[PDB]
Amino acid sequence: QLTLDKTDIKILQVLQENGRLTNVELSERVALSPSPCLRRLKQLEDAGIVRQYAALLSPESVNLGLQAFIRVSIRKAKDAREDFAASVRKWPEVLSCFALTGETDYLLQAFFTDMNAFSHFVLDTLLSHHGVQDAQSSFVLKEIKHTTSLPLNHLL
């Protein structure tokens, strides 16, 4: 079970918040010299800790006013879970999809311009999928918090 030191956590905490920092900029943030700082970054990156760097966008800025959480009930037939998994990976409007432990078989998170766009997706793609028994959706009224930064204080 992974264990990091005080400054390696600091590095990871800076990178999560600012994925596009030069080494000097990171060095300054974590209180190291660029050489030791770069050396630390290597090993973290080489450990698989960092899986991707991403630009995160404002959904409103690209006319995606509608954010849906869709609860999908899967058909109880063979390959339905697999087939559905495969299709969801090819739907760009669905950002995330998890098999969950409760009543909802799959929770999907998806973005749309408006309800008309959402309606076309649900009726013409989602519910028509041979592996999908049913779906029900709720929508975002307000984003309270949304970060991609994982908690790391358990590592110290």
Work out how close the CB of 71 gets to Ca ion at its nearest, in angstroms, rounded to a whole number: 9
Residue 43's binding partner out of Cl ion, its own copies, Ca ion, none, with CB under 5 to 8 Å set by partner kind: none
Distance of alpha carbon 57 from alpha carbon 62, whole angstroms = 8
Task: Select from 7, 83, 104, 125 the one that contacts its own copies (CB under 8 A).
Answer: 104
Nearest CA among 86, 88, 8, 17 for reference residue 54: 17
Distance of alpha carbon 52 from alpha carbon 119, whole angstroms = 32
142 binds its own copies (CB under 8 A): yes
Per-residue binder mask for Cl ion (CB under 5 A), 110-149, x = binder: ----xx--------------------------x-------
Residues 144/138, Cβ–Cβ less than 8 Å: no
Distance of alpha carbon 49 from alpha carbon 61, whole angstroms = 31
48 is in an annotated binding site: no
Considering only residues 31 through 90, tell me which ones interact with its own copies, judged by CB under 8 A: 47-59, 61-67, 69, 75-76, 78, 81, 84-85, 88-89
Say whether 13 sits in a helix, a strand or coil: helix
Interacting residues with Ca ion (CB under 5 A) = 103, 105, 134
